[PDB]
XYZ file of C-alpha atoms in Angstrom:
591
model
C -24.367 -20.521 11.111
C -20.916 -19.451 10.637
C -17.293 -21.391 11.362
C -15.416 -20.384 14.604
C -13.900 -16.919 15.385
C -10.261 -16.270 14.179
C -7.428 -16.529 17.204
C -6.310 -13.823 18.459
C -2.972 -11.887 17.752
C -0.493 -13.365 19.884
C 2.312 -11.713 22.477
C 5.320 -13.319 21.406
C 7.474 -14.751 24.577
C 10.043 -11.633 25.745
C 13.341 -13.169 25.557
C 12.266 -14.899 22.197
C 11.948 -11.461 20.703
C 14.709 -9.947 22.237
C 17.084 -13.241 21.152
C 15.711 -12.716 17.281
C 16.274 -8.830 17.395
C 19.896 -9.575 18.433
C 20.041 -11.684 15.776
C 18.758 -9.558 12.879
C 21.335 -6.812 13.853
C 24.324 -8.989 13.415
C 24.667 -8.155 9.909
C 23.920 -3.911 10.020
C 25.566 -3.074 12.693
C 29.008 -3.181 13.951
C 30.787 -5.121 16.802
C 31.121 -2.925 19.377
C 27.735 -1.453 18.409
C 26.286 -4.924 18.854
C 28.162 -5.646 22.250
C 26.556 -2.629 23.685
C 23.216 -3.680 22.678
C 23.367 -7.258 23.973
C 24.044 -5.131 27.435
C 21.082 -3.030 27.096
C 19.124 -5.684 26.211
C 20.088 -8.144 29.239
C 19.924 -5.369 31.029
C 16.117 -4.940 30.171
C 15.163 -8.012 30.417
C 16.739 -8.864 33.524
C 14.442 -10.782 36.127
C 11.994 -7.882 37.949
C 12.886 -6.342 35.299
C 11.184 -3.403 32.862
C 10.986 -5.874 30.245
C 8.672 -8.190 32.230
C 6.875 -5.472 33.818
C 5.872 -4.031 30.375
C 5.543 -7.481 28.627
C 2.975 -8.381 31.288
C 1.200 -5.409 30.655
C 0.793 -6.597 27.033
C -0.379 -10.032 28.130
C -2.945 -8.095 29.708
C -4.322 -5.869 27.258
C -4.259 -9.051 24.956
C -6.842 -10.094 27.502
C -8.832 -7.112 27.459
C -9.169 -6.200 23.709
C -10.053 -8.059 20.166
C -6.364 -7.517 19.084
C -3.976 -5.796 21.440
C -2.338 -4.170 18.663
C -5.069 -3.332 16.330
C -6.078 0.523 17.971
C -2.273 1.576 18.444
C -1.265 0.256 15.439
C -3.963 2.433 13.162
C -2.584 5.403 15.543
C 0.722 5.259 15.366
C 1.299 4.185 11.304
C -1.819 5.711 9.868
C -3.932 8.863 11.758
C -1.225 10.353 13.682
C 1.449 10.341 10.390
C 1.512 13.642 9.298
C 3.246 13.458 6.102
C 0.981 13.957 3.062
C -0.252 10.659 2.149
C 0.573 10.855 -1.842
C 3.524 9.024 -2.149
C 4.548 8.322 1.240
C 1.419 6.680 2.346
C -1.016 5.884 -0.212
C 0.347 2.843 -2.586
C -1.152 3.043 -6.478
C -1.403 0.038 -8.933
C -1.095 -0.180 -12.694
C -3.237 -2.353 -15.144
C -2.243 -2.917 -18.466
C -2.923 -0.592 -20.898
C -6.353 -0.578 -22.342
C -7.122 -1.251 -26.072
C -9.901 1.419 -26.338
C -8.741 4.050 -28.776
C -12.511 6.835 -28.677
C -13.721 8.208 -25.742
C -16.819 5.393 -26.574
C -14.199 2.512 -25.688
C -12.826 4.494 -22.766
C -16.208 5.444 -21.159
C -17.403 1.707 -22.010
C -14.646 0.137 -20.018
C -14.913 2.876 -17.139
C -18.713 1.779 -17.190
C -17.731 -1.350 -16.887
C -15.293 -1.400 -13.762
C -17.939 0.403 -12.291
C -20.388 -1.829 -12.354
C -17.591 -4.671 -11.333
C -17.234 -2.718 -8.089
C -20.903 -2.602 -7.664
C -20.908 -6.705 -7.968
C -18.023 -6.807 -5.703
C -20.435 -4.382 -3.217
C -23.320 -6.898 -3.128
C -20.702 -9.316 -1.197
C -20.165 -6.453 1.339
C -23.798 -5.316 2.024
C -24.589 -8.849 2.435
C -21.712 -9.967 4.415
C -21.188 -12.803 2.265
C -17.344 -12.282 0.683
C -16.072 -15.441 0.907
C -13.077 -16.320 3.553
C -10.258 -16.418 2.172
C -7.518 -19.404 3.307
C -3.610 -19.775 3.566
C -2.247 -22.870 4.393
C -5.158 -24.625 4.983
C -6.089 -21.617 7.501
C -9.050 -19.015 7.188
C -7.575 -15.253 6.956
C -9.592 -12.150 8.294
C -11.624 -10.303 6.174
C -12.703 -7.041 8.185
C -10.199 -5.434 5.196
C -11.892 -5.817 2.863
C -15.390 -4.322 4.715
C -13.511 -1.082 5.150
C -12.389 -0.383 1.264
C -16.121 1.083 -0.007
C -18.141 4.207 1.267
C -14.795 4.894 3.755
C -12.993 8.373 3.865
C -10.080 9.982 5.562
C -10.824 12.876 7.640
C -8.263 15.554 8.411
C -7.858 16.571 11.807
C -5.693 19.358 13.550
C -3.507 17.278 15.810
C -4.389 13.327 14.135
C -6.991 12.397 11.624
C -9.904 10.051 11.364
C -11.740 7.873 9.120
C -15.432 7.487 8.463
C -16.843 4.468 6.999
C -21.034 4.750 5.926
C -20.976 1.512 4.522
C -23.266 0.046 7.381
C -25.418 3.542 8.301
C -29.226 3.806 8.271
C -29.189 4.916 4.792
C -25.798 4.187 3.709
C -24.847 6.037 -0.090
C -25.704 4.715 -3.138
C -23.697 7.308 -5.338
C -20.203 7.431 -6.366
C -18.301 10.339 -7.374
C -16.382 10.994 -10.834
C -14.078 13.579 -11.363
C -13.122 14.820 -15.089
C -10.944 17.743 -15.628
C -10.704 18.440 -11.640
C -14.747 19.067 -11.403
C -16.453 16.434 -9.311
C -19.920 15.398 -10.083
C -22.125 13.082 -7.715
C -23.697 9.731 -9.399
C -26.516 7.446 -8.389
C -25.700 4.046 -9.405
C -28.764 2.358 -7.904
C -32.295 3.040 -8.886
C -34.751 3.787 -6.283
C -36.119 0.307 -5.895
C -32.366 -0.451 -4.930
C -31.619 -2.356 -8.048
C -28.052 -1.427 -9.912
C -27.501 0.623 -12.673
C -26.172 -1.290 -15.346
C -23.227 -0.834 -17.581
C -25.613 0.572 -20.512
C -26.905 3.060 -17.824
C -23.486 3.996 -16.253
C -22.173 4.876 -20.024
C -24.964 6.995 -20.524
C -24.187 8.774 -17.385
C -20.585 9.210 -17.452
C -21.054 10.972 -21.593
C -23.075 13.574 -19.308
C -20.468 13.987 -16.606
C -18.325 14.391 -19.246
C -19.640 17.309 -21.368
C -20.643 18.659 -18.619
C -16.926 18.984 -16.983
C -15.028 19.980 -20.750
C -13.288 23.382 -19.026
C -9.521 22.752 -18.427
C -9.455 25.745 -16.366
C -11.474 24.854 -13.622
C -9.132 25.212 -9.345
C -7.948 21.986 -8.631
C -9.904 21.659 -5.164
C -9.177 18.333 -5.039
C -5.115 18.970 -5.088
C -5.366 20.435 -1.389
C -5.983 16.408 -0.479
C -2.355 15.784 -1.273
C -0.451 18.598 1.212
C 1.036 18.030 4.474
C -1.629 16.574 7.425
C -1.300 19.552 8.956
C -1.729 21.991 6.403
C -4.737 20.166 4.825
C -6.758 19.983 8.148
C -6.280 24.162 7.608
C -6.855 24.294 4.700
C -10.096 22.177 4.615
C -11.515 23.702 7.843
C -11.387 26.721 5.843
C -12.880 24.874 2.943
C -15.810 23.391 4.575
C -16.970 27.058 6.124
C -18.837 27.462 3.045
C -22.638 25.641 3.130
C -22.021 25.002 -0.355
C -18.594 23.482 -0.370
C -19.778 21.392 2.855
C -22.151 19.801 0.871
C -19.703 18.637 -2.046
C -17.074 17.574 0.434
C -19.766 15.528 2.135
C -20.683 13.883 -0.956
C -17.392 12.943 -1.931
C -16.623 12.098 1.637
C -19.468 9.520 1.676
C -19.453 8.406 -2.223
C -19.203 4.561 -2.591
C -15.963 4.882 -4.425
C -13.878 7.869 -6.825
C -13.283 7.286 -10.290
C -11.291 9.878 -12.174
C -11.172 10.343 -16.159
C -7.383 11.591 -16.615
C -6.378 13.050 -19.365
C -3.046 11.461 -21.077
C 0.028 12.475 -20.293
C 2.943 14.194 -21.590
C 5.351 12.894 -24.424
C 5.938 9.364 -24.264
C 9.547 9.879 -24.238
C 9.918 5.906 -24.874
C 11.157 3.274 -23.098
C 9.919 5.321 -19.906
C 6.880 5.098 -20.641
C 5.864 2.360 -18.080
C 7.520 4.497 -15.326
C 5.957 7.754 -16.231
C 2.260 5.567 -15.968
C 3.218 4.542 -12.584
C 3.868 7.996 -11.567
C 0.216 9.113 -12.926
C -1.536 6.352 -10.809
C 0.594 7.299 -7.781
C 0.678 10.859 -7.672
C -1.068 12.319 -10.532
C 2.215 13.615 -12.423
C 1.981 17.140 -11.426
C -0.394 20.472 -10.784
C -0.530 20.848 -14.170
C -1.179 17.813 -15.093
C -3.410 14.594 -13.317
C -2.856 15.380 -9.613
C -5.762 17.807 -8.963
C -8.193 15.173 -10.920
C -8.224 13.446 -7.322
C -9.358 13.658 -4.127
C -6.443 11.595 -2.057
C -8.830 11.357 1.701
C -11.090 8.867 -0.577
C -9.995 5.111 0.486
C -10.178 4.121 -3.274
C -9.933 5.657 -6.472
C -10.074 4.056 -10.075
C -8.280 5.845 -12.781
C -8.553 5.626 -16.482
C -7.089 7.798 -19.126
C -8.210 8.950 -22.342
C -5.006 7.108 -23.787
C -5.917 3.429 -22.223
C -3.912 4.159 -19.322
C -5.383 2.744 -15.954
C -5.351 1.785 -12.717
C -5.996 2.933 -9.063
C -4.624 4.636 -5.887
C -5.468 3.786 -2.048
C -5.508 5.596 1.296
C -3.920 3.053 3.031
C -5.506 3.478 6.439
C -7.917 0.960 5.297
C -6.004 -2.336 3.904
C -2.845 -3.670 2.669
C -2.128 -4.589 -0.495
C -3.206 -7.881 -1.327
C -6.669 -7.112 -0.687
C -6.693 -4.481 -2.670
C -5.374 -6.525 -5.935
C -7.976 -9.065 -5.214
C -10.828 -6.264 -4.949
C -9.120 -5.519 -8.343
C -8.915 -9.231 -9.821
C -12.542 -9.761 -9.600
C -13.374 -6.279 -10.801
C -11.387 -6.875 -13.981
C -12.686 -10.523 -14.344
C -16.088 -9.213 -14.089
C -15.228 -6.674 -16.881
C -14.428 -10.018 -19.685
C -17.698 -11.478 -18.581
C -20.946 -10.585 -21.092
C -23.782 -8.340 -19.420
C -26.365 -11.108 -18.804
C -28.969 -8.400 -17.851
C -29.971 -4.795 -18.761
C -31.807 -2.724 -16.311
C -35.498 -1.720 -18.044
C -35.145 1.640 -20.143
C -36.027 4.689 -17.708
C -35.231 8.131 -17.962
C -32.225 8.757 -15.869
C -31.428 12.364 -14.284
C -28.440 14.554 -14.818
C -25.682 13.679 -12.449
C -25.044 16.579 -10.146
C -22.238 18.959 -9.999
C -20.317 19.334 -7.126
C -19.316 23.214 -7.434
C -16.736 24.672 -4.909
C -17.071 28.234 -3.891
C -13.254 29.575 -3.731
C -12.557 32.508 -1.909
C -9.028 34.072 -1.851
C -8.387 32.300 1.226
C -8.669 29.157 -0.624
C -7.179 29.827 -3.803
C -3.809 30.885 -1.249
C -4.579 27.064 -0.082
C -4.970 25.751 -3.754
C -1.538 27.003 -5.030
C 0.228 26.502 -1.567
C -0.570 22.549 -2.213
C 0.490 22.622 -5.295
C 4.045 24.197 -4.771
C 4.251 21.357 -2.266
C 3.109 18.419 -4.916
C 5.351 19.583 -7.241
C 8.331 19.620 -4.667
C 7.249 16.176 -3.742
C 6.756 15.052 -7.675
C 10.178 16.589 -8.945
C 12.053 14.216 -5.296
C 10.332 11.229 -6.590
C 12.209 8.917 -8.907
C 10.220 5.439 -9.803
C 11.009 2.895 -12.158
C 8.605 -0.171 -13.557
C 10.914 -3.396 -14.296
C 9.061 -6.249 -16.159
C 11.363 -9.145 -15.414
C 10.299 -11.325 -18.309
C 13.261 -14.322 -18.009
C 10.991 -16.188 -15.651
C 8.563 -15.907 -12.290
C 7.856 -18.194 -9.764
C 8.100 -21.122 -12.618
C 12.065 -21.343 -11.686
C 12.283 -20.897 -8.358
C 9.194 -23.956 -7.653
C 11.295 -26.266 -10.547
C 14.633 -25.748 -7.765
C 12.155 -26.367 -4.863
C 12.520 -23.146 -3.493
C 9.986 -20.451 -2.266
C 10.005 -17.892 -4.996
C 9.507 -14.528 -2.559
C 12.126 -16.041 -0.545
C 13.809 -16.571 -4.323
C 13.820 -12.917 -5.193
C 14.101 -11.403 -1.765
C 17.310 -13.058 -1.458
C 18.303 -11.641 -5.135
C 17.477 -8.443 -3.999
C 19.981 -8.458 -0.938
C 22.390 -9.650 -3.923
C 21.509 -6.285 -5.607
C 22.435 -4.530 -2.969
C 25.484 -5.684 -2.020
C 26.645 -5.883 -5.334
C 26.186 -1.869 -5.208
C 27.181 -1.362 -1.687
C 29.341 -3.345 -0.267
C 27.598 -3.487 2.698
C 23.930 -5.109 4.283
C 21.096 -2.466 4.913
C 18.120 -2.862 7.459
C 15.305 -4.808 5.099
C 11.570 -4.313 5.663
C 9.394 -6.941 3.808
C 6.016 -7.101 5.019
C 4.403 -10.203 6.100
C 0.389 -10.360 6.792
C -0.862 -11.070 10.246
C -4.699 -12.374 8.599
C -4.628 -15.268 10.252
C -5.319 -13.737 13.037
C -8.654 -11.620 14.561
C -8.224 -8.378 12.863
C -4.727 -8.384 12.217
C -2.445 -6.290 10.318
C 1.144 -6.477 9.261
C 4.270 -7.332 10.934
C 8.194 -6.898 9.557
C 10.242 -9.328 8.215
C 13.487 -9.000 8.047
C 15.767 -9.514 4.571
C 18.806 -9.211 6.071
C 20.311 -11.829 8.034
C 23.401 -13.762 8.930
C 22.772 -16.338 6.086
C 22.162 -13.876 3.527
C 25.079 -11.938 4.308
C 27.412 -14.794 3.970
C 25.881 -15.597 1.278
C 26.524 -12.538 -0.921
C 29.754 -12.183 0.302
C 30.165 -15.673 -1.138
C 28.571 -15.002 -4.404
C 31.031 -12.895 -6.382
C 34.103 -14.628 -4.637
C 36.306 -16.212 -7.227
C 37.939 -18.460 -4.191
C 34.532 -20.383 -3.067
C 33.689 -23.625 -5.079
C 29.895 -23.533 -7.192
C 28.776 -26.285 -4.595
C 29.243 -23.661 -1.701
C 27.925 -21.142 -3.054
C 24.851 -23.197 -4.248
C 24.751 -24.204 -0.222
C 24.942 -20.927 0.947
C 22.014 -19.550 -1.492
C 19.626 -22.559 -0.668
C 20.667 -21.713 3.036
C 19.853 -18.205 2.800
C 16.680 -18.939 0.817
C 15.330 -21.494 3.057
C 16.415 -19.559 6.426
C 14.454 -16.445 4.970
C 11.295 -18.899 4.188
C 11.413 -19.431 7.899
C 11.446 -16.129 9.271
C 8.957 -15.417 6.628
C 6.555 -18.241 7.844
C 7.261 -17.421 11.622
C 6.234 -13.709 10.455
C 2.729 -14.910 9.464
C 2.210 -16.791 12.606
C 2.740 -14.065 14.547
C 6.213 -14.808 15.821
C 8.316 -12.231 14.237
C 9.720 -9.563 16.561
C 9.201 -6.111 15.473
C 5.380 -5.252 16.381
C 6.437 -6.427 19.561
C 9.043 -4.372 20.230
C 6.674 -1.348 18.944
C 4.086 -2.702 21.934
C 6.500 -2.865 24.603
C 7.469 0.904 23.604
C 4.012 1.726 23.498
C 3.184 -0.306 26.831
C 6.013 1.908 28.423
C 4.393 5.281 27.397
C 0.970 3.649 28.961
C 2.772 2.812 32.393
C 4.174 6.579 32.814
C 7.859 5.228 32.225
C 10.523 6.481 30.513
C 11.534 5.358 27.373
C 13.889 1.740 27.931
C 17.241 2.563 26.434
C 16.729 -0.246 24.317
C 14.500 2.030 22.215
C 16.842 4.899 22.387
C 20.003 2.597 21.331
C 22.148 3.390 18.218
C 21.358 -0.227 17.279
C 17.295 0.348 17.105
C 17.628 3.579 15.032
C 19.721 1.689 12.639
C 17.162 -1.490 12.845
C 14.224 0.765 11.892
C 15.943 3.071 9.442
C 14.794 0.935 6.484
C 17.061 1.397 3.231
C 14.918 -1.461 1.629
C 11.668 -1.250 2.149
C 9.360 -3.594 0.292
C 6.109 -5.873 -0.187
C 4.839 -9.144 -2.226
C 1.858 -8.107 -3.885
C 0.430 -11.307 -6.076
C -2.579 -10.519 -8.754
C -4.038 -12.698 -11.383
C -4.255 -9.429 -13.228
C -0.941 -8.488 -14.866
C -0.676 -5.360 -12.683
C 2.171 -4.074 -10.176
C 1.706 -1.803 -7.326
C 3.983 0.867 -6.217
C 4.893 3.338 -3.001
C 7.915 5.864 -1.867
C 10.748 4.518 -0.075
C 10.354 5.256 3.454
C 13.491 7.013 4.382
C 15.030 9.551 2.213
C 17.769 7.615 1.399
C 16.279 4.607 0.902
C 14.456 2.360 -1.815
C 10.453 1.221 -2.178
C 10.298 -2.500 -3.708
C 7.102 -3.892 -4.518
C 6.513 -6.966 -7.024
C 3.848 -9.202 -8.487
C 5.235 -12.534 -9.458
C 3.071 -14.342 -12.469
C 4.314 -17.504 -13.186
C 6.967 -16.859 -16.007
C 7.613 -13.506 -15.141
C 8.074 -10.857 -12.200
C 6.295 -7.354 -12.368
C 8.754 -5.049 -10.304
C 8.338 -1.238 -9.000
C 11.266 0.330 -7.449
C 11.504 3.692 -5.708
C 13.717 6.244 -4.809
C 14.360 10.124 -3.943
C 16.761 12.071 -5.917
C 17.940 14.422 -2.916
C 19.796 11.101 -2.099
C 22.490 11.068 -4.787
C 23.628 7.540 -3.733
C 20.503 6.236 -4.631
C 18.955 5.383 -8.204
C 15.774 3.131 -8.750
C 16.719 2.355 -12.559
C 19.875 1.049 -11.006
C 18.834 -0.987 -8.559
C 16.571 -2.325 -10.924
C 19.302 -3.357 -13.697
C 21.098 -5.308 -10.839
C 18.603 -6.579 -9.853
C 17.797 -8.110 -13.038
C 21.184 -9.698 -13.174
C 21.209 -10.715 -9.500
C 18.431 -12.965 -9.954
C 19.576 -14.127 -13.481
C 23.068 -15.282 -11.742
C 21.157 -16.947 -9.169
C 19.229 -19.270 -11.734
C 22.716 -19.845 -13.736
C 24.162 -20.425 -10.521
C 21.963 -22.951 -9.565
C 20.883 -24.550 -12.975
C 24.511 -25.532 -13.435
């Protein structure tokens, strides 16, 4: 017995795509820029047409797959992206510091999450995670069935990913790493049962006199080099029987936690940011970033200082599932162990020892002259907006993402003096297997409505019209987003189509306009969790900014991201006016 299968991913209508991508460029590009686009694009979608020739060819494979987007879109954003994936792929979250203060209260609570995850697990062996709903609507959950005992794999021209969740014998260890060594741990005994969290602590005080050297090669730091290096570098790795056998291990291991050590100087008031850099990068060669092992889909970290959190290959999932994975994981750890496993002995975790030759060692300190490059470019901030959260914006009647989306186009402008192309990702769940799509910040209305804002000539009861305006119009293309009316993946499908149907690339693709429409200055993501956390990624063009934020319900957790070979951008900045932006907004309107 089960409800009915999810619809399918819809083809938008061509000229209904084509009208809102006019549309969206209005405000980022200039006139005579935008007259020439209007051309190409009545031009391609003229009757007989390329446009109709390569939208029916969508229509089609709509007809002959699950989701027509699905297998190109884990292609072209995920396996074939060559970048490393620290920082520019893989998105990291950070809890709220810990109140252990002995390695007894950190090893408890790492015990702890661990057997959370295991709970979590007995909804994904079982295939009974409950459906999640949105407006009334049931969302897809294949996400979610992807997270556990799932891997990267490098690969000389694109890379894969294995999943042994659903194998013959699918593991039943995970894999801890503590001062860069790696150790394998059953966490099931062999009637199938669970350790429990008495067991796991026992365990992880082995692991962890067993892995005191600090001067152990960070294997696990070749994870975080360029796609193209690290398939080299691990083909070379995996020649050795030995060092097969560990990568295997980790490779299949239900999940990664890794027991960081704390790191440097506080330094103050940045000591929020500095966190944030830990759980997305590690913080350097020298530091956190060889305690990993980046392929693995998901990996917990906890520090000896009560710093925690996690980082995710992002192949896998988005974000919001992987907060939620988190929310019940953390519940789980406030809830009293009803049962202890019987007393048994329990065997020594095993080592997983890597045999470096000086052809790896070359590899080793190749990847991390690259990491640190990549560390030092990396500027993050974490803002903790305590004036107010989605409380205000609901008391006004407004949507708060809309809310503080708009605020942060305020930011901007204030700044800039100009509108940027937006990103802000909206989740295609409702549909069969679906994804993401873009939604898009920047529009007509929002523009007129900063421009508004600051203008000593406009009454208060205009600009109150304009914000509600821009609010409202941004709920809508947000809501459109989600039901798979939004523009963008569509575009990408047509492009894709073309390549399919051996014809050149329409100029629409090749078009000032489109270069400027997918050259994302803002790029950001709503990522809600009834845990006080905040997740975090790099900005996705070098002179752009990352945005992600967690509203609570009196306050907003923000991250913001930039790269500091871009002089004209600065994430504590952007954060500041951002603060005031949406402060004005609420005086604005409360008056």
């Amino acid at each position: 017995h089960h409800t009915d299968p999810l619809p399918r991913l819809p083809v938008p209508p061509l000229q209904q795509s084509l009208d809102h991508y006019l549309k969206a460029l209005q405000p980022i590009v200039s006139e005579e820029e935008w007259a020439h686009t209007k051309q190409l694009v009545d031009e391609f979608q003229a009757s007989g047409g390329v446009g109709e020739r390569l939208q029916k060819g969508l229509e089609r494979r709509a007809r002959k797959t699950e989701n027509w987007l699905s297998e190109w879109w884990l292609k072209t954003a995920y396996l074939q992206y060559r970048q490393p994936v620290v920082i520019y792929s893989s998105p990291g979250v950070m809890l709220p510091k810990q109140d252990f203060v002995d390695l007894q209260g950190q090893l408890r609570f790492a015990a702890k999450l661990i057997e959370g995850v295991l709970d979590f697990k007995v909804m994904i062996d079982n295939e009974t995670l409950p459906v999640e709903y949105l407006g009334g609507k049931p969302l897809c959950m294949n996400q979610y069935y992807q997270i556990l005992s799932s891997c990267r794999v490098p690969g000389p021209k694109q890379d894969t990913v294995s999943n042994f969740s659903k194998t013959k014998k699918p593991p039943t260890h995970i894999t801890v790493v503590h001062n860069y060594q790696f150790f394998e741990l059953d966490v099931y005994h062999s009637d199938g049962t669970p350790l429990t969290a008495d067991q796991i602590f026992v365990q992880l005080e082995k692991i962890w006199n067993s892995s005191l050297q600090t001067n152990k090669e960070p294997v696990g730091i070749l994870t975080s080099n360029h796609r193209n290096s690290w398939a080299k570098a691990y083909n070379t790795l995996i020649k050795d029987k030995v060092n097969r056998d560990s990568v295997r291990s980790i490779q299949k291991s239900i999940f990664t936690v890794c027991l960081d050590a704390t790191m440097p100087r506080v330094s103050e008031d940045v000591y929020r940011s500095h966190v944030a850099g830990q759980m997305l990068h590690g913080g350097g060669s020298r530091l956190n970033s060889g305690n990993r092992w980046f392929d693995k889909t998901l990996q917990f970290i906890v520090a000896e200082d009560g710093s925690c959190g996690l980082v995710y290959e992002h192949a896998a999932a988005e974000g919001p599932p992987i907060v939620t994975l988190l929310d019940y994981v953390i519940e789980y750890t406030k809830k009293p162990e009803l049962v202890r496993s019987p007393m048994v002995p329990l065997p020594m975790p095993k080592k997983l020892r890597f045999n470096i030759t000086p052809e790896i060692k070359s590899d080793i300190e190749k990847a991390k002259q690259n990491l640190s490059i990549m560390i030092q470019d990396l500027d993050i901030t974490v803002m903790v907006f305590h004036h107010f959260g989605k409380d205000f914006p609901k008391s006004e009647k407004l949507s708060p993402d809309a809310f503080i989306q708009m605020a942060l186009q305020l930011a901007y402008y204030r700044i800039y003096g100009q509108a940027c192309a937006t990103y802000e990702s909206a989740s295609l769940r409702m549909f069969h297997l679906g994804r993401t799509d873009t939604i898009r910040s920047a529009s007509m209305d929002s523009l007129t409505f900063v421009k508004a804002m600051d203008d000593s000539s406009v009454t208060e009861h205009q600009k109150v019209e304009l914000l509600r305006k821009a609010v409202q119009a941004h709920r809508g293309y947000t809501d459109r987003a989600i039901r798979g009316e939004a523009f963008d993946r569509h575009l990408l499908g047509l492009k894709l189509q073309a390549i399919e149907d051996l014809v050149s690339t329409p100029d629409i693709f090749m078009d000032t306009s489109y270069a400027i429409a997918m050259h994302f200055h803002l790029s950001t993501s709503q990522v809600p969790a009834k845990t006080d956390c905040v997740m975090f990624f790099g900005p996705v063009v070098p002179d752009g900014y990352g945005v992600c934020y967690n509203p609570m319900e009196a306050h907003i957790n923000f991250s913001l991201s930039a790269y500091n070979s871009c002089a004209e951008t600065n994430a504590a900045r952007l954060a500041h006016y951002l603060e005031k932006a949406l402060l004005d907004m609420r005086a604005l309107l409360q008056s």
